[PDB]
Structure formats: C-alpha cells, structure tokens
Amino acid sequence: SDVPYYMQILDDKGMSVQTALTWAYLRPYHGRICSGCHYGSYRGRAFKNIHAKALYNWWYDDRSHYDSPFAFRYLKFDNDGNYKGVKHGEDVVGPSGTTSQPVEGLTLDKQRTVDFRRDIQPILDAKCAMCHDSNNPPNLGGGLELVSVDGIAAYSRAYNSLLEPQRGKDPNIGGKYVNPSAAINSLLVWRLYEAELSANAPREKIFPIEGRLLHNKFLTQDERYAIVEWIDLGAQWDNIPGPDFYPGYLV
Amino acid sequence: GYIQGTHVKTDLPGPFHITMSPDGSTLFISNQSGHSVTFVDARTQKVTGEVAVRVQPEASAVTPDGAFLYVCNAESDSVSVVDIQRKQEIKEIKVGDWPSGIKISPDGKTAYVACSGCMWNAIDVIDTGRMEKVRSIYTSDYGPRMVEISPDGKTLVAILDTVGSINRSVDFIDIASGRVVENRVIHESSNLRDVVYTPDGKYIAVTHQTPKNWLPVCEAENGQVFTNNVTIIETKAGGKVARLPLDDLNNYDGNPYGMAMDPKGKYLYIGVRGMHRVTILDMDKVLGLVRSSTQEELDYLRDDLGLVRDYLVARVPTGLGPSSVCLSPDGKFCYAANYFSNNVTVIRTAVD
Numbered sequence: 001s002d003v004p005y006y007m008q009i010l011d012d013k014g015m016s017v018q019t020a021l022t023w024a025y026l027r028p029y030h031g032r033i034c035s036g037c038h039y040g041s042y043r044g045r046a047f048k049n050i051h052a053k054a055l056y057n058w059w060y061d062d063r064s065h066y067d068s069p070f071a072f073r074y075l076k077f078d079n080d081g082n083y084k085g086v087k088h089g090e091d092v093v094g095p096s097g098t099t100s101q102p103v104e105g106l107t108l109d110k111q112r113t114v115d116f117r118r119d120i121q122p123i124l125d126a127k128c129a130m131c132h133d134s135n136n137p138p139n140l141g142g143g144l145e146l147v148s149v150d151g152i153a154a155y156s157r158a159y160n161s162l163l164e165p166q167r168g169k170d171p172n173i174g175g176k177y178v179n180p181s182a183a184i185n186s187l188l189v190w191r192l193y194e195a196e197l198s199a200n201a202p203r204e205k206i207f208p209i210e211g212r213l214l215h216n217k218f219l220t221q222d223e224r225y226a227i228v229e230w231i232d233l234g235a236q237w238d239n240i241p242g243p244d245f246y247p248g249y250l251v
Numbered sequence: 252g253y254i255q256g257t258h259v260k261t262d263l264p265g266p267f268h269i270t271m272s273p274d275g276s277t278l279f280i281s282n283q284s285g286h287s288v289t290f291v292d293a294r295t296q297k298v299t300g301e302v303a304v305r306v307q308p309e310a311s312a313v314t315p316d317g318a319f320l321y322v323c324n325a326e327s328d329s330v331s332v333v334d335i336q337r338k339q340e341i342k343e344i345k346v347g348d349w350p351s352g353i354k355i356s357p358d359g360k361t362a363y364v365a366c367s368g369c370m371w372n373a374i375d376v377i378d379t380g381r382m383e384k385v386r387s388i389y390t391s392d393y394g395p396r397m398v399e400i401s402p403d404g405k406t407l408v409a410i411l412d413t414v415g416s417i418n419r420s421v422d423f424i425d426i427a428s429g430r431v432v433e434n435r436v437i438h439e440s441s442n443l444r445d446v447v448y449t450p451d452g453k454y455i456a457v458t459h460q461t462p463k464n465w466l467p468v469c470e471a472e473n474g475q476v477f478t479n480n481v482t483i484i485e486t487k488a489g490g491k492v493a494r495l496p497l498d499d500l501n502n503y504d505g506n507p508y509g510m511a512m513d514p515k516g517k518y519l520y521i522g523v524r525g526m527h528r529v530t531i532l533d534m535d536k537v538l539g540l541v542r543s544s545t546q547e548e549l550d551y552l553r554d555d556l557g558l559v560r561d562y563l564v565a566r567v568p569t570g571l572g573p574s575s576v577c578l579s580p581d582g583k584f585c586y587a588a589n590y591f592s593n594n595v596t597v598i599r600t601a602v603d
C-alpha cells in the first residue's frame with residue numbers, strides 16, 4: 001500500500017491479454033472493489049450485480065484483518081508450458097496473527113524485476129547469438145558492449161535490434177520483434193512459441209515457408225517466460241533505479 | 252585537342268577519369284579532350300607531368316607495383332601502355348571497339364579491358380609480360396561499360412549497358428575458366444556507368460537510372476520520367492538484387508557515374524555528373540537494409556523518396572561534370588575529376 005501500481009490479466013500461457021494503464025494506490029488496511037476490467041463501474045456505469053467466488057476468499061476470519069492471499073512471486077507451468085499455478089518466493093514473514101495467509105512481497109528491498117542486462121542478455125548470448133550476427137537479423141551478438149547511435153551510446157546490439165521500429169506500424173503498439181506491454185502481440189514471442197498467439201498479427205509474412213527453423217525448443221520455460229515478463233514489463237533496459245554497476249550510459 | 256565526336260578543337264583537357272597508385276602517392280587523370288594523361292603528386296597536389304597517349308583516353312588502370320599505367324583510348328580503339336617513372340608511353344595494344352575501362356588483376360599478371368561499342372560485346376584480356384591481347388571474353392549482351400575484379404581475383408563482373416533495352420544486366424565471369432557463369436538482370440535500368448566491389452566481396456554496387464518508359468511524359472515531379480538509383484547485388488548464388496533510390500522528393504542526383512569504395516567498406520562514394528556533386532552513403536546502413544529486407548520490400552522501397560536520408564551521409568559540392576571519383580588507400584581522401592571545370596576536387600572524408 002501507499003505505492004503506485006497497475007495490473008494485467010493473463011491467459012493460460014501467462015501472457016497479458018489486456019493491460020491497465022494508469023496508477024492505482026491503496027491506503028493502509030484499505031481495500032478496493034471493481035465490477036470489471038475497465039467496464040465503466042468506476043466511470044460511467046452503475047455496478048453490475050455479481051455474485052463472485054473471490055468475495056468468499058477475502059475476509060472470513062474474525063481474528064484477521066484480511067484473509068485474502070498475498071501476491072505470489074513466481075509461477076509454475078506444466079510440461080506443455082500451460083499455467084499450472086502460483087508459486088511462493090523467499091520473501092515470507094512480529095509478525096502477528098492478524099492474517100491467515102503467509103506474508104509475501106512486503107519487502108521493498110527484495111522486490112523482483114526483470115533487467116535486460118542482468119537477465120535477458122546472458123540468455124541471448126548463450127542460446128541465440130551463435131546463429132545471429134550482422135548477416136542474420138536480428139543481430140543478437142556483441143554482448144553487453146554499448147552501441148553508439150547518433151552520438152549516444154546507451155544499450156547493446158541485441159537491445160537495439162529487438163526494439164527496432166517497423167515500417168507502417170505504430171511504435172506505440174510495437175516494433176519489428178517487440179510490442180511493449182504486450183508479449184502475446186510480439187513477433188519474437190510468436191516465434192519462440194512457434195504459434196499465432198493473438199488476433200493481432202505483427203506483420204503480413206511471419207513464418208517463412210522456406211528455410212524455416214523451429215525456435216520453440218531453443219529455450220527452457222524459465223528463460224522464455226523471462227523474456228515474456230521482460231516484454232510485458234515494457235521491455236526496459238535499465239530497471240534498477242539510479243546509477244548501478246551494470247553497463248550503461250556514461251560521460 | 253578535339254571535343255568528343257566532333258572535329259572542333261579545344262585547348263582544354265576535359266578530364267573524363269581519375270585513379271590512384273596503390274601506394275597512394277600519385278593521381279593519374281585521363282584527359283578526354285587533351286588526348287593525354289595528367290600526373291599529379293598527391294602530397295603536393297600539383298602537376299608533375301603530362302604523358303601523351305593515343306587519342307581520347309576515357310580510362311586508366313595502375314599495376315600493383317605502380318611501375319606502369321594502362322590507359323584506355325576509346326576512339327583509337329586501343330590501349331596505351333605507359334611507363335610511370337619515365338613518363339612515356341612504351342606501347343600500344345589494340346582491342347575491340349571503344350574500351351571504356353580497364354582493370355589489373357591482383358597478381359598484376361593480367362589486364363581486363365571492357366569494350367563498350369554499341370554492337371560490340373567483348374572483354375579483351377592482356378598479358379602484362381607479353382604486353383599484348385591474349386583472347387576475348389564474349390559477354391551475354393552488347394556494350395559492357397566497365398569491369399571489376401574480386402579481392403578473390405577468381406571472379407570478374409561486367410556491367411552491360413545495352414542500347415534499346417529496358418532490362419540491363421551484369422555478367423559474372425570465372426577468371427580461371429574465362430567465360431560466363433551467370434547473368435543477373437537489373438530491371439527497368441539504363442545508363443549503368445560503374446560497378447564496384449565491397450572489400451569482403453559479398454556485394455557489388457552499380458550506379459544507374461530508372462526510366463519510366465511506358466508512361467506519358469507530363470511532369471517532372473516524383474521522378475515521373477527518370478529516377479536515379481544505386482543497386483546492390485549480393486554476389487551469393489541466388490543473391491538479392493536491391494535497387495535503391497539516390498533521390499529526395501524535390502532533390503535528385505542527375506546521372507550518377509563514378510564510384511569509389513571505402514577500403515574497409517564503411518562508405519560509398521558516388522560521382523554525380525548532372526548535379527555536379529559527390530554523394531557519400533553509409534554502406535553499413537545500406538547493407539544492413541539489404542540483409543534485413545526481403546526482395547519484395549526492397550522492390551517497394553526503390554520508389555521511396557524519403558528512404559535516402561536513412562543511409563545518406565553527405566552531398567558534397569564539386570566542380571562541373573564530376574564523371575569519376577577515386578580514394579586514397581587510407582580512405583581519408585576522395586578525389587573527383589571535373590570535365591567542364593577541367594579540375595579535381597579534393598574531399599576530406601568522414602574517416603579519421
């Protein structure tokens with residue numbers, strides 16, 4: 001509570017179908033209800049009468065403030081990559097008995113994010129850059145070495161490649177291989193899962209009919225979903241606030 | 252001297268061409284109206300002599316050691332062998348009609364001469380030891396304008412500029428074999444003035460124009476009649492042929508002629524004869540565009556009039572009629588030969 005946040009509804013593959021773009025905040029001990037996902041219950045429409053299961057998962061105990069579960073850190077998937085369920089992290093916690101559920105994610109120090117340099121880039125170096133060079137777009141090689149563009153060196157080759165815009169496409173939607181805050185709409189994710197994930201096609205020709213290569217078996221589930229999380233987070237480069245030890249802009 | 256195609260005399264040299272010694276100490280300028288070749292010291296930038304050759308030279312090539320200069324005499328239908336140190340022509344070998352260009356093999360053992368006569372298709376080979384024509388390599392079509400030899404030295408391309416043809420092609424020759432392996436057609440092209448190789452030999456660049464012949468002649472806007480283009484061809488078997496625009500919407504480069512390739516292949520230099528300027532392009536952005544685009548997308552991008560600004564480094568003011576350009580071995584300087592102004596423009600490149 002007392003922190004800015006928003007939310008994303010997810011499918012069985014754990015990708016965001018719809019993102020809520022705004023900044024929501026909760027006061028301590030407070031709680032907030034909504035009829036739907038931008039249904040208009042908080043804008044132009046009366047609350048629809050709905051009897052929900054979640055209502056019984058909220059507060060059932062007289063000795064507790066809230067019996068509702070805290071946000072889980074990880075996910076577990078089955079062998080096919082479908083969503084199996086939610087998984088606890090190592091942040092678990094005075095403390096009193098004022099809630100029934102385990103206390104998770106209240107430590108600001110240990111709150112997890114996906115950083116391209118620390119997380120994605122090594123995966124790219126290991127499983128990708130071998131076959132991808134200047135001669136085979138996108139160019140994922142070069143490691144973490146910064147690339148100067150218009151007199152400014154910020155990110156690496158792989159980041160510059162993946163975030164490259166596409167002709168005839170709104171950059172607010174996405175680029176060639178990447179759609180910020182939509183993984184399901186990203187061509188990269190389309191190829192990594194080797195399927196058409198959404199009703200929005202990134203471009204006209206996607207899967208080559210000649211010399212095609214299946215990319216779905218190149219990554220483990222953790223790596224691939226790490227990329228998915230990275231894209232759904234807005235596909236940043238430096239996710240650690242303030243100056244850090246990881247490669248970046250320096251003068 | 253005579254103005255080309257006329258009996259009228261002129262005192263002006265009228266340089267049609269320029270090249271440079273592999274050691275970069277000397278510039279050799281072919282004077283079309285002067286019927287001679289001007290020697291220029293690169294360091295002091297002043298003329299060290301003028302060597303008389305046969306009548307109307309349009310081209311020249313230097314041996315790897317730099318002890319000899321092979322000059323193409325167009326109307327004499329010949330090739331002059333000149334001693335560089337002695338500043339004297341030591342021989343005349345005679346070839347097919349209108350050599351427009353000549354190139355020396357990497358080993359320096361052989362010189363290839365493109366015969367540009369309208370009804371003439373030939374590439375004449377010349378042994379440097381015999382100092383004489385050996386045989387002739389017949390191209391796929393008429394009027395080869397210029398040739399180029401790979402850094403490999405095992406392959407020879409010839410741009411075929413063919414009168415009365417909309418589709419104009421490029422021939423690939425196997426030097427050891429001595430005949431045509433493949434012919435690649437540039438569609439809707441005309442006036443191909445040059446062909447150059449990338450240092451890695453994976454690409455070739457060709458300057459030309461794209462006419463629209465099948466359309467009424469009405470306005471000058473949006474390149475309704477002529478657009479000006481540079482084409483990059485992948486030397487790979489089944490490689491892409493990418494026709495790219497040289498023009499802005501309201502600004503065109505008239506009749507691109509000469510080309511100079513950066514030693515490390517970073518930049519491309521294009522002499523623009525009509526607009527009297529040198530167009531410098533970024534080759535990593537161009538080739539980057541070629542590799543990352545399909546054939547369809549490139550074919551569509553050929554008519555994009557805003558595309559140039561992506562890969563265009565500069566357009567540099569020059570003298571009148573810069574028909575040819577050349578580079579120093581370090582690639583830090585680009586020289587452009589101006590016919591009408593009778594001079595040479597020296598350009599400091601982006602390389603530092």
Ligand code: HEC
Nearest residue numbers: 127128130131137138177187188191208211212213218219
């Ligand atoms: C060699 C076995 C490769 C490895 C390792 C990786 N990729 Fe690849 N990729 C390879 C080929 C031969 C091709 C050609 C097109 C095809 O679909 O086969 C590709 C293409 C891609 C693409 C599509 C590019 C486009 O359509 O514009 C993407 C998005 C891509 N590759 C990404 C990618 C990633 C993330 C990799 C690490 C898991 C990776 N590639 C490895 C060959 C090889």
Ligand code: HEC
Nearest residue numbers: 007008009018019020021022032033034036037038042043
């Ligand atoms: C699905 C994702 C949800 C859910 C579960 C909730 N919201 Fe709402 N929300 C959503 C979208 C797509 C948008 C607009 C995004 C955009 O314009 O780009 C919003 C917006 C808001 C706002 C801003 C004002 C407005 O647009 O009406 C507020 C405030 C807001 N949402 C609050 C809110 C509340 C109280 C919810 C109950 C938990 C809630 N959101 C859920 C999508 C979604």
Ligand SMILES: [Ca+2]
Nearest residue numbers: 238240241242
């Ligand atoms: Ca930081």
Ligand SMILES: [Ca+2]
Nearest residue numbers: 326328348349
């Ligand atoms: Ca003749």
Ligand SMILES: [Cl-]
Nearest residue numbers: 036039040041
């Ligand atoms: Cl709602």
Ligand SMILES: [Mg+2]
Nearest residue numbers: 469470471472
């Ligand atoms: Mg008009």
Ligand SMILES: [Xe]
Nearest residue numbers: 006007020024
């Ligand atoms: Xe929200």
Ligand SMILES: [Xe]
Nearest residue numbers: 528566567568
């Ligand atoms: Xe210019």
